[PDB]
Write a protein that binds this ligand. Structure first.
Ligand SMILES: [Mg+2]
Ligand SMILES: [Mg+2]
Lengths: 218, 218
RNA sequence: AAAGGUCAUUCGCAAGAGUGGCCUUUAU
RNA sequence: AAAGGUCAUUCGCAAGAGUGGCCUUUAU
């Protein structure tokens, strides 16, 4: 079973218990799970990615590098990189389903495990990591594009035009506690739009997206 | 002069312009300054710190490791570790004076410089880093303690007791725009307290501290 | 950690930038 | 990234825990 993953990883563990720990969620084993390895892998993987980002990024301005780095270490991207490994069929869990949060954390812990198993050889681990994902990362860096959210876009418009910030007002809150529906109002000067979502922010983001369009019509 | 810093670092650079760039603020050189190196150094050092932290921490709980890690990569701590280096006498800058934010950023950039100049040798750089600071880090980790802020403590108190959170509002704002004084009000149930500070958060932190007392005195 | 506004101050013919304080938005 | 409250759900005699939703605090 593990031999398969080791083959996809291109690395054979000296300590197989270290590899399964990385693959084990707290629900399956409360004494030997990946939580602490995840803490380490996050730092480790963060380093490998930044190093690539600094070398190959077309734009080295902080406002570009920071948002892009955040995406390159996001759960989303990690799940994207993990596909190749098929972690979903090596992961051990009980009270839960192997969602994208679990996958991303196991991905991080998995890299910490390799690092440790190899006698804490960062250089070796970085290369193994690059041999597997360098191209995929450089690819995403080349097609890198920072995109602002509506709430941010809106206040930059209003701070430019009237040097003021839009007022977000909570209008309604319906539904059961585990699935609420929020209706918020965005207002600037005398303009006001509405927005709804499953969270205040989502609702405000919708509201803001409207106030922008509203303002375009002038 | 650079030779003096290399002796403190315990490493001789092949590319001196690299060491120089790490020491150079944008005010002194618009084209070759430490901004990008700082980006990378932060990631590299974060990894050095975390690795030590997962191996030597008294407590491995997320709620302990996280707050503690935050302090271990904070500007405050880096200035502490950087003292020994006397970076203040090596940093190049025009517009301003070498403050703790500068020192902290140059500390990070410097390690990025060492990393790159050594041909991206992570193991080497890590050991050089430890040779200089492992002792100080282990010591801080041994004294490691999570310090909660008043606002956090207040809502945990009010949420345990009443399942509700305190509320803040600004009472008044005094002084010039570049030096304001805020007076804020903190409340829970029928209890209200005031606090003042150079910012809303400082004011609220102060107000929260007062309300905690008010609650103890019942 | 990044983004916008703003006050002060510094460099600058200008453009524009540095530094310090404040407000807000985003991400983790 | 961490902390606290809350709803749902799963495991549990209980304590307590896991997973999903929401609110909030902190840090960068
Ligand atoms: Mg994670
Ligand atoms: Mg920094």
């Amino acid at each position: 079973m593990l031999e398969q993953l080791e083959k996809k990883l291109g690395y054979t563990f000296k300590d197989k218990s270290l590899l399964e720990k990385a693959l084990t969620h707290v629900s399956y084993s409360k004494k030997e799970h990946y939580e602490t390895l995840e803490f380490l892998g996050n730092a480790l993987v963060n380093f490998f990615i930044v190093d690539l980002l600094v070398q190959y990024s077309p734009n080295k301005r902080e406002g570009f590098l920071s948002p892009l780095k955040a995406y390159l270490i996001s759960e989303e991207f990690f799940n994207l990189l993990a596909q190749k490994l098929e972690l979903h069929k090596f992961i051990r869990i009980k009270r839960g389903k192997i969602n994208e949060t679990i996958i991303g954390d196991v991905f991080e812990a998995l890299w910490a495990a390799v690092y440790i198993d190899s006698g804490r050889d960062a250089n070796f681990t970085r290369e193994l990591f690059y041999k597997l994902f360098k191209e995929d990362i450089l690819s995403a860096i080349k097609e890198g594009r920072v995109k602002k959210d509506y709430k941010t876009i809106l206040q930059e418009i209003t701070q430019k035009r009237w040097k003021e910030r839009p007022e977000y007002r909570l209008i309604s809150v319906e539904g059961p506690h585990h699935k609420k529906k929020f209706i918020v109002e965005a207002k600037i000067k005398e303009y006001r739009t509405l927005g709804e979502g499953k969270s205040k922010k989502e609702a405000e983001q919708r509201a803001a997206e409207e106030l922008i369009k509203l303002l375009e019509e002038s």
